[PDB]
Amino acid sequence: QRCVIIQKDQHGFGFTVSGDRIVLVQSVRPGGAAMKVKEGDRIIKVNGTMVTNSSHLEVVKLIKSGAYVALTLLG
Amino acid sequence: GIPTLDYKTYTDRVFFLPSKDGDKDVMITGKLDIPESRRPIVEQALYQFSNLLNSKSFLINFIHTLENQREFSARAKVYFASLLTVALHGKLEYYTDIMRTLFLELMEQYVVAKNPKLMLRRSETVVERMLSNWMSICLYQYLKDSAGEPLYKLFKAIKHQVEKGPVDAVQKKAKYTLNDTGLLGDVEYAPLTVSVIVQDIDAIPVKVLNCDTISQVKEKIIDQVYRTQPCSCWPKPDSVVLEWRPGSTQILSDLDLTSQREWKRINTLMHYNVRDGATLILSKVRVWHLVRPTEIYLTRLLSVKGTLQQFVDNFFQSVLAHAVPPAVKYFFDFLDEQAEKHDIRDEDTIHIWKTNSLPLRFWVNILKNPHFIFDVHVHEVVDASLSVIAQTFMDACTRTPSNKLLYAKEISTYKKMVEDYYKGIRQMVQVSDQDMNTHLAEISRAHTDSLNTLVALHQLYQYTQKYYDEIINALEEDPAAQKMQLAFRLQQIAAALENKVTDL
């Protein structure tokens, strides 16, 4: 379990969320703001609210409802 | 001569036909639906899911974790095991390895439980269904050789004695059957013979009954018209028309304006004034039938029993006597050695073990479901009688009712055959681990490529998906699985194969 913070860029955040009950990470843009986050990381906390019981729409909303997002993964 | 199903068809019917989402579920269908813009990645991850399943620690932890969870129906056990059989068809020695492990563990948990003679009688675990599939696999070529013969003969015989007499379409109760519960209580009828013309044009004679419903009659015709054609290609009686042309004109339908109501009565041949020698035409384009909702029963059951006695007997004499299959020898001797290592003294515990292992787990299933190996479709009426024979067959293996009344001296006669069969296998020359691994190898090499591997893999993946936490934790607990970092690998694989996706 790790805590990482990333700011938006000229090409968005720089990662892709997948899953429903267990929301996690699929690909990271090789030149985004996440590559320079690992491929295959489960998001367990987002923006203060734990996304253990969150829907995909809820996680996406949480990450997107703000300028910068700060989250807690599990690798 | 004997219509034996292909390997893939046989296996699919044996494994998945009585599964969760029905007879046309995912795997017989191959109904994998994913976008083609994802197929490369999805396959790429499914292969790593395969390599993961090939890790022993991962597979065992997976299985244990799944067995732990209460929310796991019997369906789930059976289906899962069958998926595991299909996905691991590649290295069957590894499969057999897993089975050995789980069977040893089950055995040792059973010996110091309450009753070790209860082993392999609950079907409440995965490794039992695994063993079931193992016997099914290894005995395919034995079925296609000598086993299928008197079994097909038996089926066709029962079917003949059934269709020789009246059958009710509503309640599925026939005048001729081995089942007391499925026996029809006394309507007059007649063995009619009608002339049917098929247009695709040829004229074919067909034997039916005047009390048969129009649907039943259609079935009896189609059965003769499309014999040369597999059952999957046969048309249902609801996509075929039957006409009667007397002079210069009437259409035959199960229910019509001519139906006799008071409750509706399904139309029969004796309803349309259709007597013998008539000419019918087949063009490919509440409710009661016979009954409106004892010694005769004993007599009918006994006569039917007498007619089928020959075929039942031939079947048992081929089954319980001959060159006993290598996997049977190997597994029974494995039960011997593991019974010696597990200090179970009682011989009837081993007789019960071998009984639960081979005749119950394999022969009974086929006896009740012939349509798993033969290109036939069977109705409940025949399957019921075959089930009576299956009960009879099981009682011939128990070292301890209409199936009890019907076959009396039979069971006793067959018990000697069974005990001498097991003894024959024990006094038989040992098939080493190598010979067995080789026989498995020829199967693996011959049949994996026709098998539906990706769908199996994906279903199993869904099983890991449902219990992701418990499994990842099971892998983090086990030191070997955290050494191989199997949790991280499973996490990555899960990461790739996901459905709903969003780019942020």
From Swiss-Prot, chain A:
State the signal peptide span. Answer: none
Recount the PTM note: Phosphorylated by MAP kinase p38 (MAPK11, MAPK12, MAPK13 and/or MAPK14). Ubiquitinated by the BCR(KLHL20) E3 ubiquitin ligase complex when previously phosphorylated by MAP kinase p38 (MAPK11, MAPK12, MAPK13 and/or MAPK14), leading to its degradation, thereby restricting RhoA activity and facilitating growth cone spreading and neurite outgrowth.
Positions of the PDZ domain = 3-75
Tissue specificity of this protein: Ubiquitously expressed.
What do we know about how this protein assembles, alone or with others? Interacts with GNA12 and GNA13 through the RGS domain. Interacts with RHOA, PLXNB1 and PLXNB2. Interacts with SLC1A6. Interacts (via DH domain) with GCSAM (via C-terminus). Found in a complex with ARHGEF11 and ARHGEF12; binding to ARHGEF11 and ARHGEF12 enhances CDC42 GEF activity of PLEKHG4B, and PLEKHG4B, in turn, inhibits ARHGEF11- and ARHGEF12-mediated RHOA activation.
- Protein's job: May play a role in the regulation of RhoA GTPase by guanine nucleotide-binding alpha-12 (GNA12) and alpha-13 (GNA13). Acts as guanine nucleotide exchange factor (GEF) for RhoA GTPase and may act as GTPase-activating protein (GAP) for GNA12 and GNA13. Involved in neurotrophin-induced neurite outgrowth.
Record remark: domains? The poly-Pro region is essential for plasma membrane localization upon stimulation.
Q: What is this protein called?
A: Rho guanine nucleotide exchange factor 11
From Swiss-Prot, chain B:
Please provide the record's keywords in A-Z order: Cell membrane, Developmental protein, Disulfide bond, Glycoprotein, Membrane, Phosphoprotein, Receptor, Repeat, Signal, Transmembrane, Transmembrane helix
Q: Which residues lie on this side of the membrane: Cytoplasmic?
A: 1-504
Where is it predominantly found? membrane
Gene Ontology terms: biological process: brain development; excitatory synapse assembly; homophilic cell adhesion via plasma membrane adhesion molecules; neural tube closure; neuroblast proliferation; positive regulation of axonogenesis; positive regulation of neuron projection development; positive regulation of translation
CC terms in the record's Gene Ontology section: collagen-containing extracellular matrix; plasma membrane
Q: Does the keyword Ribonucleoprotein apply?
A: no
What phenotype is described for loss of this gene?
Embryonic and perinatal lethality, due to defects in brain and neural tube development. Mice exhibit abnormal cortical layering and defective migration and differentiation of several subtypes of cortical neurons. Cranial neural folds fail to converge in most embryos, leading to an open neural tube and exencephaly. Likewise, mice exhibit defects in the embryonic development of the cerebellum and the olfactory bulb.
- Similarity comment: family membership: Belongs to the plexin family.
Protein name in the entry: Plexin-B2
Chain's gene name: Plxnb2
State which stretch of the full-length protein is shown: 1275 to 1842 of 1842
